[PDB]
Amino acid sequence: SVLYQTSLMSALLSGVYEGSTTIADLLKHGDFGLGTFNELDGELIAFSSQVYQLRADGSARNAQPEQKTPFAVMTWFQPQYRKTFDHPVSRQQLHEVIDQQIPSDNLFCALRIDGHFRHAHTRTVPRQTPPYRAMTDVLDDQPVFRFNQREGVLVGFRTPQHMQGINVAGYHEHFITDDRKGGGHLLDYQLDHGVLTFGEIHKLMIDLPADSAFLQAN
Amino acid sequence: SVLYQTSLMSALLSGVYEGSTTIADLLKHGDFGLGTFNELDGELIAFSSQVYQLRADGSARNAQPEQKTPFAVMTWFQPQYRKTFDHPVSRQQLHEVIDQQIPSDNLFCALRIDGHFRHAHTRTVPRQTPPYRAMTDVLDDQPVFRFNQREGVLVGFRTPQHMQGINVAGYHEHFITDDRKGGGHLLDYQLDHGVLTFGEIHKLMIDLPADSAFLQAN
Ligand SMILES: [Cl-]
Ligand SMILES: [Cl-]
Ligand SMILES: [Cl-]
Ligand SMILES: [Cl-]
Ligand code: NA
Ligand code: NA
Ligand SMILES: [Zn+2]
Ligand SMILES: [Zn+2]
Structure with missing residues (x-):
């Protein structure tokens, strides 16, 4: 890949x-x-x-x-790894699973989760017209939406620290519900149960x- | 390309x-x-x-x-541009020609010069065995070689400032003589006459x- x-x-x-x-x-x-x-x-x-x-x-x-x-x-x-979770696991615990399997921060990771989320909190940028306000000020004004007890899909990447100018360093993850009518850019989440697939x-x-x-x- | x-x-x-x-x-x-x-x-x-x-x-x-x-x-x-110089031109003047033609620092450039160099000054790293000394201290100790009135070939790239962690920002150019028995990493040069080919x-x-x-x- x-x-x-x-x-x-x-x-x-x-x-x-x-x-x-x-x-x-x-x-x-x-x-x-x-x-x-x-x-x-x-x-x-x-x-x-x-x-x-x-x-x-x-x-x-x-x-x-x-x-x-x-x-x-x-x-x-092209994920190399699959892990099923039958009990609740936090975003940060899932990232610990990935980081143990791919411990070099010098590689990228792609990750997907299919399952039932206890909660998924999102905040997503609204359409902008110039002259533009500072992005941080736009984000200060955006509501956080909280998806509770929803089946859905998560897509994400892990980017090396040696890439911060070029891309979003660390984890960048987005969420969509099973009915495909809700979702957003993730701030935090907890999986109740589901399947994680990922690879370097x-x-x-x-x-x-x-x-x-x-x-x-x- | x-x-x-x-x-x-x-x-x-x-x-x-x-x-x-x-x-x-x-x-x-x-x-x-x-x-x-x-x-x-x-x-x-x-x-x-x-x-x-x-x-x-x-x-x-x-x-x-x-x-x-x-x-x-x-x-x-796959150069897009060719310029022939019939009179002496410095490295920095040549870079000014390239930068006028490709003024966005956000793009890369590849450049080649075939011609007669008034001078080409080089300094190239010697083989290293660990534990390694600081690169700057190794370079302090390396002689500069001065190729005078030599036909040869220059190969180089121009790298955006938005790439400094990943690659050599700015111009990076190497030189070899016509007989293919001398050359090195360039510090400075002046072309007496020759042909520049380059592209973004x-x-x-x-x-x-x-x-x-x-x-x-x-
Ligand atoms: Cl469930
Ligand atoms: Cl995210
Ligand atoms: Cl000549
Ligand atoms: Cl150079
Ligand atoms: Na957003
Ligand atoms: Na060198
Ligand atoms: Zn996002
Ligand atoms: Zn070099």
Whole structure:
């Protein structure tokens, strides 16, 4: 597997909120991943080549192939490991399981959970119009949604510390409900029971765009 | 074109001086590039799929396909631009030509010069045995070799500032003489006349190794 990254987190955070890459373009280089939509209109979650748009009101909907993204990370998911949990386990305990199995922080990880979540707390960015406010101020204003006792799917990546300028260092995880109508970017969660599948990734492709805003960003 | 990078500069600088990637492996993903040999036994220069080993005594020799590298950057060279210089031009003037043509620091550049150099000054790392001394102290001790009025070839890359942890930010250029028996890592040069060919690169593949020293490096 190759982690295929569209653009750079530094470019996104600098104010480059639009790109020309479509959701269909993303699915050329993976069936699994995360990212942001143009104008920061929420975030995407993708697994088994199904893509959904998660928005600031807690909603999820099917992503359309023509929608565009300024930043995303995709892969052809090829997990090496599977662990079933029959009793409650916290996000941080699950990360401890992954980190024991893949202890080098110098590798990436892709992870998926299918199961029943005791709770899943989410906060997702709303669509932005320029001039842009500081991202931290936008996040201060966004409600946290709390999904309680819901079946659903989690998609995530673990990014090395040696990558903080380029991508989201540490764990980045998104959630969607079984009915595919709710979800968001995860702040914390606890799994009541479910199946974790995950694997390490050694290869990263960074595709730098050609739009003028990216080229002129500092 | 894709800039194909073997490992990380941060790993090399941390003391990971050996890898399992061979020169033949490098040529699977390019015909052009630069890098370091195992044990820091000099550096490589590659152009038109010819690879040479440049060592601390100023010498160049044909690189053997079975030799291994802990760090390298390769591409299938596809320049978009050609400029002939009939009168002397300094390294920094040449970089000004490139930077005017490719002004976004957010893109990579690959560059090649074929011509007659007024001078080319080089300093190249010697083979190291552990425990390793600080790289800066090793470089303090290495002689600078001065190639005067020599025909030769220059190979180089320009790396964005948004990449300093991962690769050599700015320009990184190596030189070899026409007889292929002298060369090194360039500190400065002046071209008397010659041909510059160069182009921009938007895609970077990072291939992270699996050897234990890389996995355990901080
Ligand atoms: Cl249940
Ligand atoms: Cl997250
Ligand atoms: Cl001449
Ligand atoms: Cl250089
Ligand atoms: Na968000
Ligand atoms: Na050197
Ligand atoms: Zn997110
Ligand atoms: Zn060098």
